[PDB]
Amino acid sequence: AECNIKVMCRFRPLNESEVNRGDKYIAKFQGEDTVVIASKPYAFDRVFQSSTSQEQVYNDCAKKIVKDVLEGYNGTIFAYGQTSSGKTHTMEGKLHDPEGMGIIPRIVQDIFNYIYSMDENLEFHIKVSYFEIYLDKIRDLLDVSKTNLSVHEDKNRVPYVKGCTERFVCSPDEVMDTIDEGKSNRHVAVTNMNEHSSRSHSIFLINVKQENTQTEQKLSGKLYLVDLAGSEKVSKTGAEGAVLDEAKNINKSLSALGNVISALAEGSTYVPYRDSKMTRILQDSLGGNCRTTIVICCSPSSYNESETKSTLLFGQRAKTIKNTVCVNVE
């Protein structure tokens, strides 16, 4: 059957760098699923206000994806927004805090809990992959030797990264250790807007393969968790040197993603998936056999009104994309 992309919007509290410089809250919320900026409606599935906690966003966004992955479908969650918007906070956040943990730790804990709650005749294999995109190069965040990798195609024409470290796991502790090791190798630079701005598009992959002993039925599952970098402007970021090169590549990749989203929204034919590595990897996520939810994080200050409008328009166009999701029966 066909299912739509579930775009969800999150507005963070105003940060110190904006509250101390003549800024005003421009976002006005009505109902439970609409946001009004400069008297222009923008309707999404669920719009989270400033004070929304991590449990709320996880329960309203990603709890369905855990059950979908275990049942046999595929899932994808990725965050899009401006610099210092809340993508890293929404996805990962503080890794060990019971109240501040983001989407990834809650997803892994709930996937293990549902596995424990399943029937006794089933058997599961879980593998974890973690890589990033930097200067149009795919680097493995678990083994530094893999300086760059290649995106190939499968028999049924679904792209995938070749050579990424597939580490098997048994308990959530190993998953958390893998996440920590991947995060420590991720690239972080200090810009004016954000002190810990991420300069790479991190991707988290877990395959939950399912086998049944009695009925010999084998089911697959591919869950993608992506933390994109934000669009940056030299006037606000003040980048000079390596940071400027990172900003150039980040802007190019995000423009490619916007192009593919617009192409899917307009019902075109070419749907340019091949213009960037990120658009290649998430091809099945956007236009194939995946139930993907986009979590757009947007700054509510008057200083980022144009960027916030661009992000909301990107989310709005993505809501009309239709995906064809079918159970992966091997």
Binding site: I115, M118, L122, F124, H125, I126, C170
Partner: peptide, 6 residues
């Protein structure tokens, strides 16, 4: 190979 079971 490290399977998990309920």
């Amino acid at each position: 190979a490290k399977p998990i079971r309920p």
